[PDB]
């Protein structure tokens, strides 16, 4: 609580040893990330099935901290770790209609939930994550 | 914090002294309340401006635990406390079109944010709150 209370007072909330922040504006993937960096954090990194479920239940399209390595169709989290367990929604990732879809969102759609690759210059609400305890 | 882990494994999350649960289905105000009771909780009770802001930032229409006393246009939280500080959206509460709007939702609309009285038999996602720390 000494650690957490200053963050709660700014609208962060706590799930399994991280704090999370949901933005009140949409932004490009890069400027979303810049906000989280400025807060001493980063875009959210999904490390378990439970954290994915927690993410999905906000019923909100959210940028998360996963981005393609160049155009290689391989993926790295913002902390540098490679993608291992994934929650792509059906049919994704797909560089839809031949567009460069290098940044990852969590989608909120009827009959389609999970991650989607999207153009990084499109805008979404975004979720920051700060690990508090190891 | 160890006692939060079973709740976190079910998708609850921690803000200030409470755990919160956002439903994955819509329901009537009364059946929403029944779900929260059977988890040892109740519908959410808004006790401060910070908690209202926390609620508003989910950008979700949610039943919360405020309900009219009969048809008297006075209000009581599900824990029995009378309404004191309030966050009605502009023009609310209003018994819209002469309907009995006895139950309270947090609305997520353009140029209209805050609470709204609504027919209790209508359906919304709902938020449970459980006080964990004294
Ligand atoms: O608008 C961009 C998106 O459009 C559609 O939802 C496609 O399913 C998805 O793959 C694409 O990235
Ligand atoms: O449809 C129910 C609601 O409709 C409109 O939003 C009115 O502004 C609100 O007062 C009423 O409760
Ligand atoms: Ca994480
Ligand atoms: Ca895509
Ligand atoms: Ca409360
Ligand atoms: Ca109303």
Numbering used by the authors:
A (entry chain A), B (entry chain E): 47 to 180
How do the authors describe this structure?
Among such receptors is macrophage-inducible C-type lectin (Mincle, gene symbol CLEC4E), a member of the C-type lectin receptor (CLR) family, which functions as an immune sensor for both pathogens and damaged self. Mincle recognizes its ligands via a calcium-dependent sugar-binding site, containing a conserved EPN (Glu-Pro-Asn) motif, and a hydrophobic groove on the carbohydrate recognition domain (CRD), which are in combination the major characteristics of Mincle. In Takifugu rubripes, one of the first vertebrates whose whole genome was completely sequenced, a protein sequence bearing the EPN motif and a hydrophobic groove was found (XP_029706534.1). Altogether, trMincle shares similar characteristics with mammalian Mincle in its amino acid sequence and its FcRγ-dependent cell surface expression.
As the structural analysis suggested that trMincle possesses a sugar-binding pocket, we set out to investigate the sugar recognition mechanism using monosaccharide glucose as a candidate for the model ligand. Indeed, the crystal structure of the trMincle CRD-glucose complex was determined at 1.8 Å resolution. As suggested by the glycerol complex, one glucose molecule interacted with the calcium ion as well as the surrounding side chains. Thus, the sugar-binding mode of trMincle was similar to the other CLRs bearing EPN motifs. Indeed, computational superposition of the boMincle-trehalose complex onto the trMincle-glucose complex demonstrated that trehalose causes a heavy steric clash with trMincle, suggesting that trehalose disaccharide cannot bind to trMincle due to the narrow pocket. It evokes the possibility that trMincle cannot recognize disaccharide-bearing glycolipids, which are typical of exogenous origin, such as mycobacterial glycolipids (e.g., TDM or trehalose monomycolate (TMM)), but instead may only bind monosaccharide-bearing glycolipids, which are often derived from self, like β-GlcCer. While mammalian Mincle recognizes both exogenous diglycosylated lipids and endogenous monoglycosylated lipids, our results imply that trMincle may function as a receptor that selectively binds ligands such as monosaccharide-bearing glycolipids. The narrow sugar-binding pocket of trMincle suggests specialized recognition for monosaccharides. This makes it difficult to recognize well-known mammalian Mincle ligands such as mycobacterial glycolipid TDM. Although trMincle may not have the ability to recognize typical mycobacterial glycolipids like mammals, it may detect fatal infection through the alteration of endogenous metabolites, such as hexosylceramides.
